[PDB]
Amino acid sequence: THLRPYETLGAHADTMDGVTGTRFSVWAPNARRVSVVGQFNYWDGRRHPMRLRKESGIWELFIPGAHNGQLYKYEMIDANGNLRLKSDPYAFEAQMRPETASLICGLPEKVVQTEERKKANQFDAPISIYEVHLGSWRRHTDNNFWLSYRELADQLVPYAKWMGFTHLELLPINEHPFDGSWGYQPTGLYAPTRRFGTRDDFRYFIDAAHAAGLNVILDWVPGHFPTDDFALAEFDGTNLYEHSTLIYNYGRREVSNFLVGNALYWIERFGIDALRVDAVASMIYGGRENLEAIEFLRNTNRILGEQVSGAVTMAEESTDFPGVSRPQDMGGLGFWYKWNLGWMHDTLDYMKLDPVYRQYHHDKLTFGILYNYTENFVLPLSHDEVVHGKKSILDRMPGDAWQKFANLRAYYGWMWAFPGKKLLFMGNEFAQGREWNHDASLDWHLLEGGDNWHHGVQRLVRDLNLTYRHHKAMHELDFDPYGFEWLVVDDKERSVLIFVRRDKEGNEIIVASNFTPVPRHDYRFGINQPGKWREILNTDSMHYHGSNAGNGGTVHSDEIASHGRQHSLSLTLPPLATIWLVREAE
Numbered sequence: 229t230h231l232r233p234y235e236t237l238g239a240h241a242d243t244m245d246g247v248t249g250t251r252f253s254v255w256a257p258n259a260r261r262v263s264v265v266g267q268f269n270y271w272d273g274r275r276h277p278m279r280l281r282k283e284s285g286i287w288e289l290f291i292p293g294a295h296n297g298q299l300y301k302y303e304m305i306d307a308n309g310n311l312r313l314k315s316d317p318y319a320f321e322a323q324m325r326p327e328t329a330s331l332i333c334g335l336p337e338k339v340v341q342t343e344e345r346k347k348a349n350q351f352d353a354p355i356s357i358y359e360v361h362l363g364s365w366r367r368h369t370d371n372n373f374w375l376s377y378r379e380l381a382d383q384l385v386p387y388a389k390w391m392g393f394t395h396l397e398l399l400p401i402n403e404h405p406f407d408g409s410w411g412y413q414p415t416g417l418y419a420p421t422r423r424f425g426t427r428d429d430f431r432y433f434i435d436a437a438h439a440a441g442l443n444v445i446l447d448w449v450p451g452h453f454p455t456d457d458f459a460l461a462e463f464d465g466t467n468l469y470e471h472s473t474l475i476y477n478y479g480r481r482e483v484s485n486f487l488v489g490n491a492l493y494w495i496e497r498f499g500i501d502a503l504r505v506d507a508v509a510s511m512i513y514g515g516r517e518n519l520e521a522i523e524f525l526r527n528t529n530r531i532l533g534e535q536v537s538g539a540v541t542m543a544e545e546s547t548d549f550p551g552v553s554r555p556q557d558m559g560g561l562g563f564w565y566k567w568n569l570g571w572m573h574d575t576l577d578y579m580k581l582d583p584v585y586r587q588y589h590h591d592k593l594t595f596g597i598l599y600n601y602t603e604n605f606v607l608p609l610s611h612d613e614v615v616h617g618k619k620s621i622l623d624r625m626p627g628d629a630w631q632k633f634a635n636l637r638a639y640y641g642w643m644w645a646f647p648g649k650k651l652l653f654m655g656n657e658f659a660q661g662r663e664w665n666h667d668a669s670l671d672w673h674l675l676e677g678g679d680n681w682h683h684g685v686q687r688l689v690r691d692l693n694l695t696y697r698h699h700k701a702m703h704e705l706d707f708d709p710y711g712f713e714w715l716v717v718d719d720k721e722r723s724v725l726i727f728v729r730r731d732k733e734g735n736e737i738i739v740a741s742n743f744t745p746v747p748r749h750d751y752r753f754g755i756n757q758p759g760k761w762r763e764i765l766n767t768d769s770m771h772y773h774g775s776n777a778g779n780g781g782t783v784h785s786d787e788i789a790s791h792g793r794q795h796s797l798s799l800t801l802p803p804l805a806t807i808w809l810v811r812e813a814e
């Protein structure tokens with residue numbers, strides 16, 4: 229009604245007086261007269277004229293014979309007296325490249341969210357996200373054509389599922405005219421792009437993802453106004469959706485309706501489990517504060533939480549605007565999760581340095597625990613990091629080849645144990661050497677031939693995901709100080725960092741990282757829980773083409789004081805590696 233305007237505006241199928249047809253509604257308070265033109269009219273605007281309404285400003289009409297499948301637009305007389313063809317803002321399907329225009333299809337049946345999908349979005353869940361641009365994941369060999377939604381449901385769902393990810397994150401699949409925007413310069417907010425098939429196909433892709441046990445996070449764009457093809461600027465002749473560089477007018481009721489309404493659309497009518505909002509800073513800009521942007525995010529989040537609890541939202545915000553992932557009543561904004569850009573910048577800068585200069589930059593691996601409780605973090609290695617001459621993640625690493633791969637493997641070992649949910653952009657899991665190209669398939673060829681270093685990283689990421697999801701200690705208490713404790717925080721001259729993760733029932737898994745090529749034998753450190761400890765993950769294993777250094781079985785604790793603790797372990801730490809230890813019941 230007042231929240232889901234997509235249910236009454238646009239083109240919908242109805243039958244009045246007995247006979248069937250479709251009814252068209254468009255919001256335009258100004259503008260002299262408005263008509264519907266399509267395949268049922270010879271595109272003649274003199275035929276079917278619409279009637280405007282007073283206390284809404286909506287032109288409407290019920291055209292008999294006009295059915296699902298035909299194309300249509302609106303021929304209007306702009307409030308300044310101009311003749312302009314407009315596509316429906318609430319178009320559910322469209323046609324890209326060789327034109328622009330709306331379709332008649334109506335709304336899809338609608339999806340009631342199951343309980344396993346709500347459980348998976350929670351703060352106590354393991355959450356590991358595979359971020360993908362549908363247009364450049366893979367391509368057909370012969371001709372370089374895109375995979376359709378249905379082919380992605382048969383190839384991209386099983387892959388993300390086998391690799392052990394819990395979530396799939398899509399770069400924007402709303403209709404957009406150019407591939408170079410990656411989806412962030414949209415023209416139709418309610419239509420899945422037609423690049424990969426119909427909107428029912430997309431719906432089928434989401435069903436398949438649910439059926440495989442994945443949740444789906446969709447990149448959502450309320451921060452970028454349609455500045456293309458004349459799709460939403462000067463709509464009726466006045467600044468309908470825009471202000472008075474082209475930004476939204478979040479102040480108006482109906483505009484806020486068009487945006488909020490779009491959010492319930494994806495979650496209820498496509499079964500989307502979460503929404504991510506980018507450039508939140510670009511939206512809410514202390515002194516520039518756009519009061520109406522801050523309030524729009526707060527109302528969206530509040531309404532979502534009330535109308536579809538179980539679904540959550542995530543945000544990227546680059547100015548440390550306090551309280552991004554906190555309840556509205558204080559700081560506010562009201563997002564469930566926040567991208568940890570600081571950690572991504574810190575660990576990468578650290579990771580980049582010659583292993584030999586790391587002793588002077590230790591503070592880049594520790595500093596992130598100081599503020600881990602001010603926001604609910606996702607640790608993101610996303611698309612922004614591998615474009616525009618920023619190099620891939622693997623090209624950031626130092627040394628000859630084997631060293632770059634050992635470094636990258638150790639980093640993932642660190643990343644997957646650090647408080648925060650995980651996000652990995654496609655191509656990173658097999659260590660692509662080249663930067664991402666939206667125009668081409670990923671470098672899947674690196675994985676051709678006999679077992680190689682890239683298979684090694686790919687196997688690691690899978691074990692990393694599987695292990696991480698098995699042990700509560702690794703995910704239960706990310707956002708509670710009890711969940712993480714330092715064991716060795718100040719071994720700067722050797723670059724060794726050891727800490728513990730802790731589940732609700734007190735169980736500890738020990739994480740040790742060696743960030744230099746020098747292997748450490750008989751490395752002694754204090755523990756809280758004496759007994760028998762055993763490796764469960766070792767990034768230097770030869771299964772990932774490491775050198776296979778390690779502890780080769782159970783190691784018992786010694787009652788020998790160390791680092792202020794009554795008991796200790798003496799271990800091998802493999803070079804440029806991280807390991808995880810679990811305690812054996814006795």
Ligand SMILES: OC[C@H]1O[C@@H](O)[C@H](O)[C@@H](O)[C@@H]1O
Binds near residue numbers: 367368668669670673
């Ligand atoms: O089109 C398919 C092929 O395209 C190339 O650009 C990629 O590097 C290959 O890995 C891929 O398999």
